[PDB]
Amino acid sequence: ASNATYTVDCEDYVHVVEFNPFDSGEAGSLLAYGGISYVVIASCRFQEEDSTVEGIEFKTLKTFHHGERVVAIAWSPETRCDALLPLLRFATAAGDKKIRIFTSDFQDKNEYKVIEGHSGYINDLVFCSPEGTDIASVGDDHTCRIWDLDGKQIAMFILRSPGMSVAWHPEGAFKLMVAEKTGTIRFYDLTTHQAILSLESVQVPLMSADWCVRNTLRIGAVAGNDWIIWEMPRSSYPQDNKPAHADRARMFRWSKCNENVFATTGYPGKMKSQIAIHHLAHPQPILIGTAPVGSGLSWHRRLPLCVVGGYRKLFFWLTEM
Amino acid sequence: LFLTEAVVGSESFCTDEFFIRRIHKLVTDFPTLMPMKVKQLRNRAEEDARLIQMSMQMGNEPPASLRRDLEHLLLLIGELYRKDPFHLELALEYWCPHQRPPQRQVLLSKFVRQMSDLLPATLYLPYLKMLRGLASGPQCAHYCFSLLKANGGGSP
Secondary structure (H helix, E strand, O other), X not given: OEOOOEEEEOOOOOOEEEXXXXXXXXXXXXXXXXXXXXXXXXXXXXXXXOOOOOOEEEEEXXXXXXXXXXXXXXEOOOOEOOOOOOEEEEEEEEOOOXXXXXXXXXXXXXXXXXXXXXXXXXXXEEEOOOOOOEEEXXXXXXEEEEEEOOOOEEEEEEOOOOEEEEEEOOOOOOEEEEXXXXXXXEEEEOOOOEXXXXXXXXXXXXXXXXXXXXXXXXXXXXXXOEEEEEEOOOOOOOXXXXXXXXXXXXXXXXXXXXXXXXXXXXXXXOOOOEEEEEEOOOOOOOEEEEOOOOOOEEEOOOOOEEEEEOOOEEEEEEOOO | OHHHHHHOOOOOOOOOHHHHHHHHHHHHHHHHHOHHHHHHHHHXXXXXXXXXXXXXXXXXXXXXXXXXXXXXXXXXXXXXHHOOOOOOOHHHHXXXXXXXXXXXXXXXXXXXXXXXXXXXXXOHHHHHHHHHHHOOOHHHHHHHHHHHHHHOOOOO
16 A cells, blocks of 8 residues: 555545646646535645645635535636636535535635525536536436526436436537446436437446546446446447456546546445556556545646545545656 | 837838838827727726736735736837937827817827826826827927926826
8 A cells, every 4th residue: 555645634524625627827736625514725736846845835725614514526617816806616515415606706705605406415516617607416316407606407307316426528518427326327418408328337336437538538437346438439338347446436537637547436444445546558556545534536637646535634646657 | 019129129210201100100090090999998908907006005916917008008109209310390290289270189189188187106107208209399399398287287
């Protein structure tokens, strides 16, 4: 088990962690993490980006009182730290089945809006517009729902099982990916409000799916114990299927810098949650990390670096390319 | 900036009367043929400047994304008339007392006065440099002299 390259202390348990995938106009990479009753927004700078930094410079920028356990965080594309018009916008899902949109100027103006209408737990959410006006959410009510920033439901797709992950297509307009617990991944067009296509996993339950940003034909997921890769439009069947974890895989995320590298996490388990970093050319994980109990997995935008939340700590692994 | 540094930079520009006339026409045609756009832009700039500057003044530093084209514009006017080889007292275009004041002369004179009304601290220097350039050619001397003198009759 590799030790984490960097470790940052947190006030409480980290339930979710997400790097800002967008350019905020700052030299540092923005990071959001959700606790039991709060969301923290921080800036991270690494020695690999700036030779004036020894290891990791971690600065808390803002803390938002949430009052509920945060389960998912989505960054808005409008998020900017530019000194002329700073705007922080992100969405959260929590155990109360509500979405909260937070807006801040990083000064005194801190607003949040509550969106209601899911009848079950929300499992995942994303901003599903380049303009950052629309939010997609999925949950245990067997719905995928589309919301404006006004909290009005624009659209609703009835699922055949609980929606487990949702992702916007990185290049193609109007394409939403929805991963269902029974192994089906569906693609929806938000203009026509129609399902375009599905993929099926060989294993169940399907727990997380992500798009490869560097190769928009590739989808990766975790189902049962295994990680699964599809290459579109070649087949509805997996191209690759290999073991990820000895007992239940939970999260899958593609590296933002390398189309052959991805991370998986094991389920919040008695054997301390393993992070496994995989490279498609290798039959085994290139790195196996241990986090004592960790939830959330996110990749840095530029560096070959991933973060996992744990017990009062963030753990960072740099992958040698 | 390019017209200021690269064109007039040439000391040979000092030579051709017809160089000065053409550029003079190009500069006078812009406020005459599209002043609406011109004014839009002026006001925009003044305002943005004021805003960001004041914001920083609270405790920050001015945004690296600033662009003072007006100041470059004021310097351009100052440098263009600064010295003319022809010595034809062309700067006369800046002064409105032959002609029952040609509409063009009135608008330009209004431009010089409008720029003096509630002058932001950031435009103070470019404006002086502009005036400096506009007071060449004796007739012009006297006229702008008096103009400004009276305008000061509080404007920084």
